[PDB]
From a paper:
The C-terminal core-domain functions as the oligomerization and protein interaction domain.
We report the crystallization of the full-length HIV-1 Nef after experimentation with naturally occurring Nef variants from patient samples and were successful with one such sample. The protein adopts the elusive closed tetrameric association in the structure. The asymmetric unit contains two protein chains that associate through symmetry to form a tetramer. Compared to the dimeric association of the earlier ‘open’ form, one subunit of the core-domain swings out with a relative rotation of about 174° and translation by ∼22 Å with respect to the respective center of masses. Thus the Nef tetramer can selectively abrogate the recognition of SH3 domains while allowing for interactions with other subsets of its repertoire of protein partners.
Numbering used by the authors: 74 to 149, 179 to 203
């Protein structure tokens, strides 16, 4: 498909797709593993890969983009992808760090 920007509408439906149909959930996070993912999504769905960002360490990393419903939790610093459907409702990345926005 053609080329388009991530949108909340889109982000949400995506968050679903991946959860619902396959294993991102609980996947150890990594730089490349992210990146790969980006493109993948892109090739898959023509989203310009500039929307997959999370808040900085320590602890739980919150997706920057409102409506992308995955965060990165620690293991016991090591991060695993986790799905959470409330980040559809709460834009955590925002109260935590309104500076960027």
């Amino acid at each position: 498909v053609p080329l388009r920007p991530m949108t909340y509408k889109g982000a949400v439906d995506l968050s679903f797709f991946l959860k619902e149909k396959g294993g991102l959930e609980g996947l150890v996070y990594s730089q490349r593993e992210k990146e790969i993912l980006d493109l993948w999504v892109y090739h898959t769905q023509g989203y310009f890969p500039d929307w997959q960002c999370y808040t900085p360490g320590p602890g739980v990393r919150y997706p920057l983009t409102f409506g992308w419903c995955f965060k990165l939790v620690p293991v016991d610093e090591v991060l695993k992808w986790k799905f959470d459907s409330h980040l559809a409702h709460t834009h955590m990345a925002r109260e935590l760090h309104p500076e960027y926005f």
